[PDB]
Amino acid sequence: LMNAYENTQASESRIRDADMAEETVAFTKNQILVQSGTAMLAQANVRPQGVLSLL
Amino acid sequence: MIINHNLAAINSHRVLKFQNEEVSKNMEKLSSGMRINRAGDDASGLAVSEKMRTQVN
Amino acid sequence: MIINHNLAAINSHRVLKFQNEEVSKNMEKLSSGMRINRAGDDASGLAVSEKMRTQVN
Numbered sequence: 001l002m003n004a005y006e007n008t009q010a011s012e013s014r015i016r017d018a019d020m021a022e023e024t025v026a027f028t029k030n031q032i033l034v035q036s037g038t039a040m041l042a043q044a045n046v047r048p049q050g051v052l053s054l055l
Numbered sequence: 056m057i058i059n060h061n062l063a064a065i066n067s068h069r070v071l072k073f074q075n076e077e078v079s080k081n082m083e084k085l086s087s088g089m090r091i092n093r094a095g096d097d098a099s100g101l102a103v104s105e106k107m108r109t110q111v112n
Numbered sequence: 113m114i115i116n117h118n119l120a121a122i123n124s125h126r127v128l129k130f131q132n133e134e135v136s137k138n139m140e141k142l143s144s145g146m147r148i149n150r151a152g153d154d155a156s157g158l159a160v161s162e163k164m165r166t167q168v169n
Binding site for chain 2: 129132136139140143144
Binding site for chain 1: 058059060061064065068071072
């Protein structure tokens, strides 16, 4: 029962538990992506401002 | 630089996990006190050890 | 001044990209602690290392 329990727990952890190092890189990647997206959006708001030079 | 994928991070994570597997194996080998604890390390050695254990008993 | 192209930007981008490639190659050296991971850093050294690894086993 000890042997089966430890192997069973290992098998369960291999499926449900998350590997923090595996996707903390993904988290940082997504943070960089969202920052770049916010910057590009804010750049996009001021894009039509050049029209006013013709009025 | 390509911010849509961190290849260096992926490689570091891969090597880190495959080193962690070996360190866990070494830790369990230390804990058990036996060179061949689980199977597959060497089948011939495990079988020989088992039959010599039978012989000594 | 010509504005259709930014030659200084192109040159800086080229040197930056190749420096990034160099640092990425150098990163795995520290990550794995091995002087030669991907074949191409050296050939004769890798071959003799593998041969002597077989010898030590």
